[PDB]
């Protein structure tokens, strides 16, 4: 118990100094009206706050369904083949069997979905993690739509595939963080909303919107408007002190850290100690070596 | 107020005799403490003290609470049960407001409490305006001398992260040491102003 | 500092929370100093509530001069802000 008391009495001062140092380093970093994060000298610290330009208050964890699905399951859940598949019209008020233009739209949809899955699995989350904080709780909005409109799973829907594609594309076009007709403004807008677009396309696939959710035109329009409004509410406001907010958000948990790990390691990181207590390497071997003890 | 086991608290409310829970003998507690204080703190000595004090108040023999003795909670429980009470110190209590018998049985008994030198009236302080330091012309320090409260670095940081520029301007300028000077537009130094 | 044209404006078309706080505070302060009220009063006595009800009807006669990091600025009416 004496050790515990001593640790408290020392850790308090350690973390107080750490937090003062942190705040002094980032007090001047603020979000500007052009979306960039800059310090008092105008030097750009980030080109978009958090790399997506969203307030950390408004984000919630969402699951990427397409990430962990196999190729077979991904096809089953997202591939629509009107030539071979006829169950789609069983879920619809309008027959679309053996329709050419609708099949072309579905093929473009599935090509974009496969591209998104490739980008997720190879570039973004190669470790296969699916739960990540994004703007707007889209699953909750879908549940709200199911409850509000009393969606009967047995009632065929009046939604056409083209309605779904056009609505989702227009929604994605209305998630504006950066404004401007230039080329790099378009690039940064696309990058900022890329992950959200991937989630939206995986959630609102035509096969899901029809066979899984049984949405109708009114419910789908309400979902689109609600998602657009919620996203526009998550955008970080210009003039927010993101630097001091980050300093406080890192410092506050330090006051409960364990006094290498804990406050000592944080102190080593923050001062950029040229000599640290426990230098180490994490050498990863080749796949055939790493799978055998003898070669290791 | 505090027990002899690190259990310190302040009075949050006072109830009169009629409004407090009572036993079937009409015992009303002097103090009611929250159960949640016990588990995390693991002050089992507080509970053993309450049970032993109940036994000693009933029997008149003084209670030996010396450490490292063979006084077990089982023996104290047997002594308490010998007086016609629930061995573990629980009692059926009734609600003062409705007279209804509480669903839970209460741990009720005598415990030694201490009045601490920290009284709220010794501490309550409010300043609107008053004395200032001669040199800095800011609110003086101290409750006793009618002084202001320190708006420190951490509070300034909190108001910065909030984004309340006018709050900072008011707290640090309009409410502490507002002053006016005349500067020369040529050399930028404070001028002679009448 | 060069004023940006109304058509060229690139900042958000929504009122920021900081902008809303500043606008309400400034209008309430002006009302407390006997500025004419541009909304019908139903017996309100707090200038802040009067400014809030003016805002709900977009009747606050104020602009926001949003400054870009280079010094160019855009003037947004409290009425046109969303």
């Amino acid at each position: 118990g004496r050790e515990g008391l001593i640790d408290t009495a020392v850790k308090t001062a350690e973390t107080g100094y750490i937090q003062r140092r942190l705040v002094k380093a980032m007090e001047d970093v603020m979000v500007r009206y052009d979306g960039t994060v800059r310090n008092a000298m105008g030097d750009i610290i980030q080109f978009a706050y958090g790399e997506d330009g969203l307030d950390a208050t408004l984000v919630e964890y969402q699951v990427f369904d397409s990430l962990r699905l196999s190729t077979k399951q991904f096809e089953k859940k997202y591939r629509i083949d009107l030539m071979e598949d006829r169950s789609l019209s069983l879920y619809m008020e309008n027959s679309i069997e053996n329709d050419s233009s609708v099949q072309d739209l579905l093929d473009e949809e599935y090509t974009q979905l496969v591209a998104d899955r490739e980008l997720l699995c190879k570039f973004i989350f190669p470790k296969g993690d699916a739960r990540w904080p994004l703007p707007v709780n889209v699953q909750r909005i879908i549940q709200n739509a199911l409850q509000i409109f009393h969606l009967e799973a047995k009632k065929p829907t009046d939604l056409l595939p083209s309605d779904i594609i056009n609505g989702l594309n227009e929604l994605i076009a209305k998630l504006t963080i950066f404004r401007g007709s230039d080329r790099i403004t378009r690039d940064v807008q696309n990058n900022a909303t890329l992950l959200f677009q991937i989630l939206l396309r995986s959630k609102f696939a035509v096969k899901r919107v029809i066979m899984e959710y049984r949405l109708n035109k009114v419910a789908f329009e309400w979902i689109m408007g609600e998602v657009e409004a919620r996203f526009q509410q998550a955008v970080v406001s210009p003039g927010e002190m993101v630097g001091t907010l980050a300093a406080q958000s890192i410092g506050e948990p330090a006051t409960q850290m364990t006094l290498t790990l804990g406050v000592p390691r944080l102190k080593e990181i923050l001062n950029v100690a040229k000599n640290i207590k426990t230098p180490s390497l994490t050498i990863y071997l080749m796949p055939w070596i790493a799978a055998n003890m003898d070669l290791a | 107020f505090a027990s002899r086991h690190g259990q310190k608290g302040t009075i949050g409310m006072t109830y009169r005799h009629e409004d407090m829970p009572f036993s079937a003998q009409g015992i009303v507690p002097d103090i009611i403490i929250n159960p949640h204080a016990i588990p995390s703190r693991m002050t089992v000595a507080h509970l053993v003290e309450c049970q032993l004090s109940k036994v000693s108040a009933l029997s008149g023999f003084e209670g030996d609470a010396t450490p490292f003795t063979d006084v077990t909670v089982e023996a104290v429980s047997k002594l308490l049960r010998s007086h016609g009470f629930q061995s573990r110190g629980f009692e059926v209590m009734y609600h003062g407001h409705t007279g209804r018998k509480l669903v839970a049985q209460v741990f009720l008994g005598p415990t030694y409490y201490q009045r601490l030198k920290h009284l709220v009236d010794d501490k309550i302080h409010a300043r609107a305006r008053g004395p200032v330091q001669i040199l800095t012309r800011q609110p003086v320090e101290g409750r006793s001398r009618d002084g202001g409260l320190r708006f420190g670095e951490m509070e300034r940081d909190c108001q910065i992260s909030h984004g309340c520029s006018s709050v900072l301007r008011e707290r640090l300028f309009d409410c502490s040491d507002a002053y006016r000077v005349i500067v020369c537009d040529i050399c930028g130094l404070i001028a002679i102003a009448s | 500092g060069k004023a940006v044209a109304k058509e060229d404006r690139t900042t958000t078309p929504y009122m920021t929370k900081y902008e809303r706080a500043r606008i309400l505070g400034t209008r309430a302060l002006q009302i407390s100093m006997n500025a004419p009220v541009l909304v019908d009063l139903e017996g309100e006595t707090d200038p802040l509530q009067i400014a809030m009800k003016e805002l709900a009807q977009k009747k606050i006669p104020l602009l926001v001069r949003r400054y870009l990091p280079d010094g160019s600025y855009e003037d947004w009416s409290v009425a046109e802000l969303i």
Partner: peptide, 15 residues
């Protein structure tokens, strides 16, 4: 809250 400046719009004060 001070990352911008407030001005009067006289066009509105006329109307």
């Amino acid at each position: 809250t001070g990352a911008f400046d407030i001005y009067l719009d006289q066009d509105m004060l006329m109307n």
